[PDB]
Design an enzyme around this catalytic site. Sequence first.
Site, PDB file in Angstrom:
ATOM      1  N   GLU A   1      53.606  53.294  -1.091  1.00 19.50           N
ATOM      2  CA  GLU A   1      51.989  55.092  -1.087  1.00 19.50           C
ATOM      3  C   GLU A   1      53.020  55.991   0.258  1.00 19.50           C
ATOM      4  OE1 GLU A   1      50.834  52.266   0.156  1.00 19.50           O
ATOM      5  OE2 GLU A   1      49.869  51.781  -2.139  1.00 19.50           O
TER       6      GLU A   1
ATOM      7  N   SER B   1      62.504  55.900   1.483  1.00 13.30           N
ATOM      8  CA  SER B   1      63.030  55.133   1.648  1.00 13.30           C
ATOM      9  C   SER B   1      63.916  55.242   2.982  1.00 13.30           C
ATOM     10  CB  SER B   1      63.818  54.244   1.280  1.00 13.30           C
ATOM     11  OG  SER B   1      63.088  53.566  -0.322  1.00 13.30           O
TER      12      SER B   1
HETATM   13  C1  LIG Z   1      62.028  54.210  -0.791  1.00 14.99           C
HETATM   14  O1  LIG Z   1      63.687  55.840  -1.193  1.00 14.99           O
HETATM   15  C2  LIG Z   1      62.267  53.951  -2.476  1.00 14.99           C
HETATM   16  C3  LIG Z   1      61.840  54.394  -2.972  1.00 14.99           C
HETATM   17  N1  LIG Z   1      60.940  54.160  -4.497  1.00 14.99           N
HETATM   18  C4  LIG Z   1      60.719  52.928  -4.451  1.00 14.99           C
HETATM   19  C5  LIG Z   1      59.865  52.531  -3.638  1.00 14.99           C
HETATM   20  O2  LIG Z   1      58.250  53.544  -3.866  1.00 14.99           O
HETATM   21  O3  LIG Z   1      59.261  52.132  -2.516  1.00 14.99           O
HETATM   22  C6  LIG Z   1      60.156  52.511  -6.192  1.00 14.99           C
HETATM   23  C7  LIG Z   1      61.715  52.076  -6.521  1.00 14.99           C
HETATM   24  C8  LIG Z   1      58.863  53.299  -6.413  1.00 14.99           C
HETATM   25  O4  LIG Z   1      58.894  52.797  -7.424  1.00 14.99           O
HETATM   26  O5  LIG Z   1      58.928  54.193  -5.937  1.00 14.99           O
HETATM   27  C9  LIG Z   1      57.539  54.572  -5.527  1.00 14.99           C
HETATM   28  C10 LIG Z   1      55.972  54.367  -7.248  1.00 14.99           C
HETATM   29  N2  LIG Z   1      54.835  54.146  -6.700  1.00 14.99           N
HETATM   30  O6  LIG Z   1      56.515  55.167  -7.821  1.00 14.99           O
HETATM   31  S1  LIG Z   1      59.109  51.034  -5.713  1.00 14.99           S
HETATM   32  O7  LIG Z   1      59.243  50.381  -7.280  1.00 14.99           O
HETATM   33  O8  LIG Z   1      59.679  49.979  -4.719  1.00 14.99           O
END
Ligand SMILES: *C(=O)/C=C/N[C@@H](C(=O)O)[C@](C)(C(=O)OCC(N)=O)[SH](O)O
Length: 264
Positions: A142, A44
Site C-alpha cells: 500500500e 521501496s
Molecule cells: C518498491 O519500490 C516497490 C514498488 N512496487 C512493488 C510494491 O508495491 O512493493 C510492486 C512491483 C507493485 O506492483 O507496486 C504496488 C502496486 N499495488 O501496484 S509489487 O508487485 O511487489
Amino acid sequence: TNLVAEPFAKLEQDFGGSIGVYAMDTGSGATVSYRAEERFPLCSSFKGFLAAAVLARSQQQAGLLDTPIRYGKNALVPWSPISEKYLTTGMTVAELSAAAVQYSDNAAANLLLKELGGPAGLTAFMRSIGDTTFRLDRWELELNSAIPGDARDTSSPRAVTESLQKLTLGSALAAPQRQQFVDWLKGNTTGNHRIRAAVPADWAVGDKTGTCGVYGTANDYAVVWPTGRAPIVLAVYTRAPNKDDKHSEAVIAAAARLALEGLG
Ligand SMILES: *C(=O)/C=C/N[C@@H](C(=O)O)[C@](C)(C(=O)OCC(N)=O)[SH](O)O
C-alpha cells in the site's frame, strides 16, 4: 538566478515531472541541491533505512541478526523472490535484511517492519537519528500509491542524504553495523541503471532504489566512494502529475551525473 539548477530544470521539463536532488561531498562539504527539500514518495527506498533500523536493534539484542525466522506462505506477497525461494528453509534476520535491500523483497520488508513495531517504529528510529522529515505510514504494498500531494510514506532528497550519511559514514550505528549496512547497499542488484550508471566504473557504490511507478515516481540513493577521495552521498527522486506517467531510469542517471559534475 540559479545557473547550477538550469540543467536540472531542463531535465525535469523533458521528463514531464519533478526531480529532486541532493548530493554532499563529505570531504569538502560541497553540495548540489535541486528541489532538495520537497517531499517525494519513498517507495521501496524505505527498505534501506529499514535494514539500518534492524541493525541498530541488533546492537542491543544478542544474536538477533543470526536468528532464523520460519515464516509461512501467509507472509508472502508479490515480488518476494528471496522469501519465496527460502520458504521451505527459513531465513535469518540478516538474510531478510539483505533481501529487502538487495532484491527489494516485499515479504522480507514486512517481516522486518513487524519486528520494529511497524511503519511507526521505523519512523521513530529515523527521528532518533535526527531526521524530522521521513515518515512511513503504511506497509508493502500500500505504501507505493504515490498520490500527488499525499505526505504519507515520503521524505525529501536532503533528509534522505543526511540520514544515509549518518548511518553509513557517521556514528548513528556501531562500526560493525555501519559496515554491514554499507555491504548490503554495495551488493544491491536493482540499481544498475540509476546512480550506478552515472558513476565512473572504478568507483564503489552502495545504493537502494524505489519504484512506485505510478505518477512517474521512482528514486535511488547512494553512497559513492571515488577511488582516492572522501565519499559522496546523494539522493535522486522523481514524480509526475498524472497516474499513468512513466518513471525513467535514464532521467535518474542523468540527474546523478549532473550532481557529480556540480560537486566540488
Ligand atoms: C518498491 O519500490 C516497490 C514498488 N512496487 C512493488 C510494491 O508495491 O512493493 C510492486 C512491483 C507493485 O506492483 O507496486 C504496488 C502496486 N499495488 O501496484 S509489487 O508487485 O511487489
